[PDB]
Amino acid sequence: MRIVPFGAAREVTGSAHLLLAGGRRVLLDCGMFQGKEEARNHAPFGFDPKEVDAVLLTHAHLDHVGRLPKLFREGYRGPVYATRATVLLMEIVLEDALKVMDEPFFGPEDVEEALGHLRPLEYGEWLRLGALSLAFGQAGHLPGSAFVVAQGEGRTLVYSGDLGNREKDVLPDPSLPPLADLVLAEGTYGDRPHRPYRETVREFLEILEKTLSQGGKVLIPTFAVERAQEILYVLYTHGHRLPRAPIYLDSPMAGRVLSLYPRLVRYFSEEVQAHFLQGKNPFRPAGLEVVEHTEASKALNRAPGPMVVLAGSGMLAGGRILHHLKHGLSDPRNALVFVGYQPQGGLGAEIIARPPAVRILGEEVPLRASVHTLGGFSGHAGQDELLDWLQGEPRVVLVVGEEEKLLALGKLLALRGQEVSLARFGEGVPV
Ligand SMILES: [Zn+2]
Numbered sequence: 040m041r042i043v044p045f046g047a048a049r050e051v052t053g054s055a056h057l058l059l060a061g062g063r064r065v066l067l068d069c070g071m072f073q074g075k076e077e078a079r080n081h082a083p084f085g086f087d088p089k090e091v092d093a094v095l096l097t098h099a100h101l102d103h104v105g106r107l108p109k110l111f112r113e114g115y116r117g118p119v120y121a122t123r124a125t126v127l128l129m130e131i132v133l134e135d136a137l138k139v140m141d142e143p144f145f146g147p148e149d150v151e152e153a154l155g156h157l158r159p160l161e162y163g164e165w166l167r168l169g170a171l172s173l174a175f176g177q178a179g180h181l182p183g184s185a186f187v188v189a190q191g192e193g194r195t196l197v198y199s200g201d202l203g204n205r206e207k208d209v210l211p212d213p214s215l216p217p218l219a220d221l222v223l224a225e226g227t228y229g230d231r232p233h234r235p236y237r238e239t240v241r242e243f244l245e246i247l248e249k250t251l252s253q254g255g256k257v258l259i260p261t262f263a264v265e266r267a268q269e270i271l272y273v274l275y276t277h278g279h280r281l282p283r284a285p286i287y288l289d290s291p292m293a294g295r296v297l298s299l300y301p302r303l304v305r306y307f308s309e310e311v312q313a314h315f316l317q318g319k320n321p322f323r324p325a326g327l328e329v330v331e332h333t334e335a336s337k338a339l340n341r342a343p344g345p346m347v348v349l350a351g352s353g354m355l356a357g358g359r360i361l362h363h364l365k366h367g368l369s370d371p372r373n374a375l376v377f378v379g380y381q382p383q384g385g386l387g388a389e390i391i392a393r394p395p396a397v398r399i400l401g402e403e404v405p406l407r408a409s410v411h412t413l414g415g416f417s418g419h420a421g422q423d424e425l426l427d428w429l430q431g432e433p434r435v436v437l438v439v440g441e442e443e444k445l446l447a448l449g450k451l452l453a454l455r456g457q458e459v460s461l462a463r464f465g466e467g468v469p470v
Contacts, residue, residue, distance in 0.1 A: 071105025239415020
C-alpha cells in the first residue's frame with residue numbers, strides 16, 4: 040500500500056492523491072490548480088485516469104474537486120463517492136466553475152458526466168474494493184467535509200483533506216484521526232495559529248456597531264461557498280444588539296448555496312441543528328437581501344449607508360465587491376472587513392498596506408474607509424490545531440501549503456519525535 044501525490048505538493052491548489060493498494064487504484068480528491076498554477080489544469084494528470092477503480096471526494100471546494108470533470112473527459116467512468124452535502128454542493132460549485140471560466144479544460148458535457156457518477160457516502164460508512172476498506176471521517180471544514188481512512192494490507196492510512204477550524208460554531212468539531220501507519224496531512228497554516236474565534240467575533244460586532252451607527256457601510260469581501268453564510272450566522276445570532284440596517288448578500292452564487300443550506304441541517308453543529316429544530320433558519324438574519332442582478336448591485340454603490348454588504352471574489356480577484364470598494368473606500372465612515380485569507384501581492388494585501396490611495400477598476404481611489412482583518416474567521420485548522428490533530432501519529436507526509444509553512448510544521452513534528460516529509464509530485468510514499 041502506498042499513496043502518490045498528484046497536486047498540492049509544496050503548493051495549496053490541485054489536491055489529488057492516487058492510492059495504490061490491493062491491485063486497486065483509488066483517487067483521493069481531484070481538484071483544479073488555481074492562482075499562478077492555473078495552466079497546469081491543461082497539463083496531464085501524471086497517471087492514466089482510465090485505470091482508476093474509484094474516486095473519493097473530501098469536500099466540494101474547487102481546489103479538491105475541480106479536475107474531476109477532466110477525469111471523465113479523458114475516459115475514466117468509475118464511481119465517485121462523497122457525502123450527500125459534498126455531492127449537492129458540487130453541482131452548484133462546478134456549474135459555476137464552468138460558467139466563470141476563461142480558458143476551459145473541460146466542457147459542460149464533462150460536468151454532467153461527472154455529476155452523474157457521484158454516489159453518496161456518509162461519515163462512518165465503509166466502502167470495499169478488493170482487500171481495501173475505505174471510510175469518511177468528520178473534518179468540519181465545510182458541510183459534508185471529511186478525511187479519508189484507508190485500511191488494507193494490514194496497514195492503515197489517513198488522508199486529511201482540509202481540517203476545519205474547531206473554534207468556530209457552524210460546522211461540528213473535526214474528529215481525531217484513528218492511529219495510522221501513515222497520515223497524508225495539510226499544512227495551509229503550518230506556520231501560525233489563528234486569533235481566537237470568540238474575541239474575533241467580538242471585534243467583529245464592535246466594528247459593525249460603530250460603522251452602522253454613523254450610518255456607514257460595512258464592506259465584507261467573501262467566498263460564496265461557506266464563509267458568506269457563516270458571517271450571516273453571526274449576524275443572525277447577534278442581530279438583536281446590532282443597529283437596524285439592510286444586509287445585502289451581493290452574490291447570486293452565495294444565495295444558491297444559502298438556499299441549499301436548509302437541506303443540509305444534519306451536516307452542521309448541534310448548536311446550528313438546535314436552531315433548525317425550533318423551526319428557524321439561523322442563516323437568515325433580519326433584513327437579509329440577496330441581490331440578483333448588476334443593476335441593483337450598482338445602485339448599492341451610490342446608496343447611503345448604513346448597510347452591511349457581502350460579495351465576492353473573496354480574494355478581490357474580481358467581482359461586484361470591487362465596485363463596492365471603488366465607491367465606498369474614500370469615505371472614512373465606512374469599514375472594509377476582511378474575513379478571509381488574502382494572498383500576498385494582491386489588492387487585499389495592497390490595501391492592508393494602507394497607501395494614501397489604491398488602484399481599483401482603473402482609478403486611484405483615496406483610502407479613507409477603515410480596514411480590518413479578522414483572521415479568526417479562517418476555515419482551516421491553525422498550527423496549534425494541526426499539531427493536535429497530528430498528535431501521536433508516527434509518520435506524517437505533508438501536502439497543501441507553501442514549502443515554508445510545511446517546513447515550519449515539519450520542524451515542530453520532528454522535534455516531537457514524529458517522522459515527516461513534504462510530499463513530492465509523482466514520488467509515492469509507502470503506507
Ligand atoms: Zn477547502
